[model samples]
Target chain A: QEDVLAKELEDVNKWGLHVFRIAELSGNRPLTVIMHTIFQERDLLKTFKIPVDTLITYLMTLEDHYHADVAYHNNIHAADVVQSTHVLLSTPALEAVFTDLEILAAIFASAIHDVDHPGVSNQFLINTNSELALMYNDSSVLENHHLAVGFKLLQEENCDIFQNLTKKQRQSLRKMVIDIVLATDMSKHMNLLADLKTMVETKKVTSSGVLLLDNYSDRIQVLQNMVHCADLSNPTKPLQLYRQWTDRIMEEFFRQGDRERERGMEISPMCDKHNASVEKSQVGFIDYIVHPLWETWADLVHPDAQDILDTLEDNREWYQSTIPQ
Target chain B: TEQEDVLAKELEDVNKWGLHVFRIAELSGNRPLTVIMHTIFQERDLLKTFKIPVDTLITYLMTLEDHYHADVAYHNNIHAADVVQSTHVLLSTPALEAVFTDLEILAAIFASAIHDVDHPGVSNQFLINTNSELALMYNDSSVLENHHLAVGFKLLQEENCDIFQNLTKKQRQSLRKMVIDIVLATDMSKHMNLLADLKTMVETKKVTSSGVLLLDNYSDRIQVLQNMVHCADLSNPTKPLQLYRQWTDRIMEEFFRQGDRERERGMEISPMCDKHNASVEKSQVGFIDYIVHPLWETWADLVHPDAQDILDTLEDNREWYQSTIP
Candidate 1:
């Protein structure tokens, strides 16, 4: 039922990468299931000198740490994100651009970026004066929380997947993981885009059309944007899968609104079903929030990701048609 | 003086209930009474014919208006003013204009003005569950409406504020019964029966040669006033799209606040009141289909030509919400 890539060579078309069905086939254990397939297929388990027994336990424990309760921010979405990063790296233009260490760091970041999320957003916590908000003093609260819990779980013996690495190797991996994970915060969205836009505008692609990261600054920035793209790339999926994601997100948003009502707080926009706008919201999300980023990303990858731009526009029109003139 | 004229001008074209009360509130220095007072009384020449002293009426209206808590999102003085405007439109319809006497019109206007005074931004259920002083005072029946009426009339009696000082004792007696009865019926608990009466009247309405209505009898007249006030109460959906959406937004905020309180006490939030659970579009459609449409359909039937445009605007607004949600 699963199609495992043998080597994940520099060129991979995501036409066959349907995540929801994959999640179902993997028995809802996407983090472990996906990583297991990647490790065995790419032979990373042997290459990294990881014991097969230890790898499985570590992946499962890490996956277990993800809150199953959030709609768009839950374990399934994390797995969806890991799958997204998988394909984004597979682009021929980006092929061989990252070392296996960087690739592994990127995938690991996607899977644990939202660990132990409580379904509500950071603004929600702050406005309601949540204890979590107080703990962080409202400064990069979720990012700090996800980073803290993610590292805590890694310290557990059997789940210490990175234990085999030397002290220097582990320190480098830690910095890469923290950099990629922290960039997933929405606060970092505009900064990531501005940097990506600058890179693309400067025409940094090589003669063969692949981008070469000459320094840590350039490499880390690109990796940050790659994970960010993968996190938000749900709307860029196939139309049917894309619509299903909207349903999942709307239901999640509705539940958050419900909790707000229960607590006698102001219901957040797009959260209150009674005040919801499925079409208008989707339209705005695509028109303003989404399209600009995708246009820039597709430009960054050039013709390698033109398919994504087309799918995005097609989905936008679907929401546009949901309303009459 | 310049500000007053500017405020008066914004209200000039608003007889169709397209009035923007927030702007009026801002321009009128947060007192919307001057605009309503000038529009309702000055336009109708009530000060000359009914001999309502201008200063006394403004004093009374402003005091009544001031009682409307500025933060009570949907049911403040602006809503009171909006309803009065709708009542103005309904009575002046070609078919119904001559049917109501000056006294009946005054009673209708007065009832609209004072229907939801001093609202605490909560519902009747909230009042009853908390065993509020209001619920206790009104014996858990018509709590808000009765208080509004009692407080409003009491304000009028505070020397130099009674505009009705000129009307005969008999006239005041008749106006009191009519105003109080109409105000109480605006309560949602009375919705079904009030709508039931309007439905029957529409089914049996008589049209004279000039297409003018010929309604007679005290029961029928009172029923018309009940439906008139009720129509204005629910008229938010039938206004121009901009105004209608504003009303919808205000009500949801107010309703959300109520739901928030319900959750605080471990109580189940009421339908359409809970921000989290209420399907804004679905709840709106339900209100239109089950409540607003049936009532408006009858009212429109009675004044077919005059109401056709309103009905059309309402249908257009319904599709907008339906498309956005579903």
Candidate 2:
């Protein structure tokens, strides 16, 4: 069974990853499964002299940090985000753009971004006056904690597979990871999306069709969007996969609603299960946020990524048809 | 659309599900009812064996799809198609082969295919809340499930569409009983009680010298069939990653809409209707533990290797869901 799960991982780089199967097959070692798979896929292990067993061992322990109760923001979602990272990175224009170091930072950050996530949203933490909320002052509280967790996961000697890197290399990777993971805060989508649109408009590409980035900010800007893009890629997947994420996230959201309702707070949009039509909200979600973002990425970053865009539209129309008569 | 003059209209042939519904399923995270039904009926040669007229069968299926409310995210025709395919796959298990009478098989397939016709997408809880006609009509007991069976079976009353017309009244009676039992068991509220029924049968199940479970009893046959459809319905999180996620979204979106309706109607909002407190992630893990694992375990136990392998994948999916969480 584990082998079957591993065998499925061979296709992770190809397209959508079944985060659950990955976790199951690895005996709840999805982080271990993914890091090695992505690591080996990119030849990071060989280039870095990272001991496979030690890395696996660390990845093994990394899975334990994710709260098993967090429906949407747990390890599976983490693995999914990483898989989305791989998919984005594999896009034609993207494949040739990022350096190995950037790819590692992007994928590694995705792997552990939500480690030890509580089964509640950032706002819930803040509004409910949770300790983490006070600690981070309620500003990108969860995102900041995720960044901290990712670095913490790597801090132990046994898991510090980055042991071989020079101080400069380590610093570079750390900054990139912190930058990208923190960018996953939902509130930051507006700025990142705006910047992404600007990049596509002024997208610099070499005569040979490779993306050109002379400035570090331009490069980091795209990488930030990529991480953010993967985090929000839920609405952009092929219809089934896209909807599945929608279902899980909605469930997670509704679970929060349950808590709110019990607390005598107003229910959030799309959270009230009895009244909300999952269809209309999805239509609104796509028309406003997902479709525009994906359409931009398709035209700008990876010209060939229009296929994913097509599926998003396809699902959008499907949702539209299902709108209450 | 005047049928476009039939022959005069198109020089081109079309795939009812061809790439379109298949692609739609890809986009929607569902399998088209027609696509899977078309394939499964072919595999077992069921339609032909029943002597169902090809034209009538086609028309019946198309009309059935038409009745499925696309708006009902989870219980619509796409899920109908998925369940029929699942129904076929389960029965096609080699050991179970030759165990089902053709009529029983007919009930199994038909029950799943039309289980939730014209669903308005709200749960029975909501329907009963408002005293809606649908709730009143069925006396609010198995409200949605009862409506589905009546509406879908009534659809088969048409002159060209009644595939069951060939069967004797007695044969139709048995099919009706089996079909009704299986479809009603689909109600989520019925899960725990029905699961007890499944547990009861599994305990008393007599495995023959071969791998098959006992089919000598009519009640036993329907019991397994009931368990089968329930398994398929809850089996959403148990599929290959790509497909499972699609299912989760469809149902969740439906739940979200239902949640909104509570607010819209100025009624007390439903619990877990809110996507926040009851988000899909923990819901799935909870769902599988409560319903899927227990049901599938007994099913595989009753059939052993035939279903045991399926149980493995379901476990694999369950484990994946577990990893999805902390």
Candidate 3:
């Protein structure tokens, strides 16, 4: 009897909100997912003085910018990341830990992180002399594009989400968003994970048990690592959903492979569709990247990310079981 | 080697505005090691102040010189000397007189001398596309710059070349940090970001009643110096046309060599590197138009008339190249 979009929107504030259903029920209008999630975080609206219509306009344009036909990097993946970021930020251990401004920037960063992604990896762009790669000078090419495009979107008259922020507030939000989004580049993973480990070992905490980060570097590092974790949260989702992601991502990878083959260029790793091992690739990803990252993340937040870690472990086992001997 | 008089005459003009490092190299038997060391001694008592030993510094320069592949047409020790001299000239501008601390000036000079040490006469794109060991070591980000920095710093760690041996821990750390930053900014991939920051600084610069620029913090100070090094690295085209043309020949030869290698490897040749299809005049014009002029203009804005002559010469050279186009 319940409207599916309404029911799904209600579930957005919690973990396991069934993003696939929302994408289907809402007819792939990611603006609905992002809008509902933004409204659900209503304090960001009132605190930042973001007008509903302006926010709606910006989200709609942002969704339109996402490539609808891309297998994995389209709006649905971004919406999934936004919800995942919101869930991670809402962890009880992190409750009251981040400022409202920080929360707003994190959510915004997740929503626009992959907006307008070209489905090709950074290395692919660089190798092929892409305009985006050339414009950014081959440094964090796609991430830089996302930051510039996302902020440039706000330049439109009716889409100024941060229109009410003071100059200082706007600059602070800009810096935080740039740092968080740039950190999502996978090449940065090892360094980010190392820094996170060091932070955990030497962590300082408030008397009430909230993590204490006294400097800009410390605070931004935590925020950067959190957003990075959310971006890599695919393998940590429920198995059915995780496998859906695996399928979509492999298709994306294979498409890149097809392009490279057509161009007579070298195939990128895990991108060769004819010889790829989907199960083995996912198992290796979980072992090498996802598990290591989330395990350390769990160590820092302690018990809050336990469920996510468990799901990741179970997911890895499922892939492991499916791999041919 | 019989031109003893010419050697002294060339070395005599070492501190002059128009000092020709190419001439110095010819007179000094293809080793500009002495020119680099002499420039350091002339710049400041950096050697004495930092207590870097003269003999050790000589050893360090030789070590650095040996690393530069003489086979590489444009990125050899001669190019290092050219950058060192250009950096000195840029810093000597009256507008920035006493603007930087002695440590910063020392770091700038040192970074210039070592910026492209052991460069492979290829672009970072070449290295990454080839899946080079350097690309792997640096995780494919700023690959060559990272290698240059590591090698430059590693040489200083040698027993005989511990150039900062006398400095306090803080001073040494500060020097190393500044040098790393300056060298890394030389990566062409950072061109837009560096130029944008320079533009912002020019827009926000504060000038005293007497017209001296004020920099309020470390970030501003280092950012200015970063662009300074970058400007000097790209200053070859602004030189006297004869000298600039000599540099152009060397760089194109280097580019052609890279293109040759790419073709032989069955890889797609990089832009401007194709020898058979190349138009050096057209490429130089585009380089100046897009990358070089915008940066130097913002820089000239920051330093005002100090960079005006360089800008004029750049425009003059651009027209010469433009006239030759087609």
Which number leads on TM-score? 3
lDDT of 2 by residue, A1-325 (tens): 9669868887877656676667778776676677678888889888878888768767877777887777787777877888888878877776577788888888888887888888777877866757675445345778767766666666566888888987678778877887787788888888888988888888877765778777778888888888777887877666667777778888888888888788876677777776677778889988988877777778776677777787778888898998757
Q: After superposition, how far is residue A312 of candidate 3 from its true place, in Å?
A: 0.7
The sequence of per-residue lDDT tens digits that candidate 3 reaches over residues B1-326 is 45977777677766655578887888777778555566556556777777777888888888888888989999999888888888887888777877888888889988988899889999998986775766544544677886787677777767698777887767876887788788889999999999988898888888766677787689998998899989989988788898899899999999999999999999889998898899888889999999999988888888898889889999999999999975
How many angstroms is residue A52 displaced in model 3 relative to the true structure, after the best TM-score fit? 0.6
**Chain A TM-scores, candidates in order:** 0.92, 0.94, 0.96
Candidate that scores best on lDDT: 3
Off by over 4 Å in 3: A206-208, B1-326
1 or 3: which has the higher lDDT?
3
* Model 2 chain A weakest lDDT span, ten residues long: A129-138
Please give the range of 10 consecutive residues that has the lowest summed lDDT in model 3 chain B: B131-140
TM-score of B-chain for each predicted structure, in order: 0.96, 0.87, 0.96
Model 1 chain A worst lDDT run, 10 consecutive residues: A4-13
Candidate 2 or 3, higher DockQ? 3
Candidate 3, residues A1-325, lDDT tens digits: the string is 1386777677677766688888887778755555656655656777777787888888888898999889999999989888888888877767666887888888888888998998999999977757665345456879977876787787677988888998778767877888899899999999999999999999876666677777779778988999899889998888878889999999999999999999988999999999888888888898999999999999888878999999899988888999767
Docking class of 1: incorrect
Please state the Cα-based DockQ of model 2 relative to the true two-chain complex: 0.01
Clashing pairs in 1: A257-B276, A258-B276, A264-B260, A274-B278, A274-B279, A274-B280
